[PDB]
Amino acid sequence: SHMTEYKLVVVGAGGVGKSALTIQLIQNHFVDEYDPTIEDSYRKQVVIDGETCLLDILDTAGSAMRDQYMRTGEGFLCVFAINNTKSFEDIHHYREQIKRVKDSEDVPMVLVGNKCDLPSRTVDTKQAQDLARSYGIPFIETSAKTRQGVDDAFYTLVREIRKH
Amino acid sequence: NSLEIEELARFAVDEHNKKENALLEFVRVVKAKEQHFTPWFQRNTMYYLTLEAKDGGKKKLYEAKVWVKRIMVTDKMRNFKELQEFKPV
Ligand SMILES: Nc1nc2c(ncn2[C@@H]2O[C@H](COP(=O)(O)OP(=O)(O)O)[C@@H](O)[C@H]2O)c(=O)[nH]1
Ligand SMILES: [Mg+2]
């Protein structure tokens, strides 16, 4: 059987929910305490638009190490938390860094606003949607807690990698 | 590998003596569990060691957590070990 493998990297400031999103996707439950400095990679077999895909997903915590992660990565999930302004401010830095390392103006990415289950919100949909627009990438809101948008964020990133 | 584990337990006691101002004397490993992590270009392991050491002459039980990171930089393996925690049972 034909399969296509994709190399995906999850990046964002500490505490935005990188570990939680990945483990939701992989394990179908919310991990509210996962070591904040541990990195791991995961493999999930999934059908996206009829293609049998192997997603090799790296959960970063963040170096030469980090540079390697970015050369190897094909698509990047840029995560902030909707109740943290500075996590949203940091996004430029991550995107700039990836563009620096890979040395390309077009790098598959998706902007993710996580924790959208929460009644507090510091960042507006429109602010995020404007940023995504300026970079020409898609924006999904998600909750690692309730699984809202989780599948969609990863699938959307795969679609982005295909586009290139 | 019982050697490897024993060497890491000795390392844990040593690092506890140096960084937590103690003078425990390693006796033996009582049990070990091992958790593995493979971020890209790494083979990392957290060890959970239960060990026996003498505190002012008296045998007591301790739980040590030791982190071993092994990373391929260029085409060369770089190895790193670090005591994470050490506490009495
Ligand atoms: N309510 C809610 N909490 C979340 C969500 N994602 C992560 N968290 C919590 O926020 C903290 C950070 O999660 P973690 O995945 O460790 O963040 P990381 O540092 O980016 O890997 C943890 O206590 C999580 O339980 C979410 O979507 N909703
Ligand atoms: Mg994490």
Author numbering:
A (entry chain A): -1 to 60, 65 to 166
B (entry chain B): 4 to 92
Copied sentences from the primary study:
The crystal structure of Affimer K6 in complex with GDP-bound wild-type KRAS was determined at 1.9 Å resolution, revealing that Affimer K6 binds to a shallow hydrophobic pocket on KRAS between the switch regions. The Affimer K6 binding site overlaps that of SOS1 providing structural evidence that K6 acts as a SOS1 competitive inhibitor. The binding site further overlaps with that of the RAS-binding domain (RBD) of RAS-bound RAF supporting the RAS:RAF immunoprecipitation results. Affimer residues 40–45 from variable region 1 are important in the binding interface between KRAS and Affimer K6. The Affimer tripeptide motif formed of P42, W43, and F44 binds the shallow hydrophobic pocket of KRAS. The P42 residue forms no interactions with KRAS, however, it is critical for function suggesting it has a geometric and structural role facilitating the interactions formed by W43 and F44. W43 of Affimer K6 and V7/L56 from KRAS form a hydrophobic cluster strengthened by Affimer residues T41 and Q45 forming hydrogen bonds with KRAS switch region residues D38/S39 and Y71, respectively. Individual replacement of P42, W43, F44, or Q45 with alanine reduced Affimer-mediated inhibition of nucleotide exchange. Affimer K6 bound both forms of KRAS with low nanomolar affinities and showed a significant preference for GDP-bound KRAS (KD = 1.36 ± 0.87 nM for GDP and KD = 7.88 ± 1.09 nM for GppNHp, Student t-test p = 0.0095). All of the small molecules have an aromatic ring that inserts into the pocket and which is reproduced by the side chain of W43 of Affimer K6.
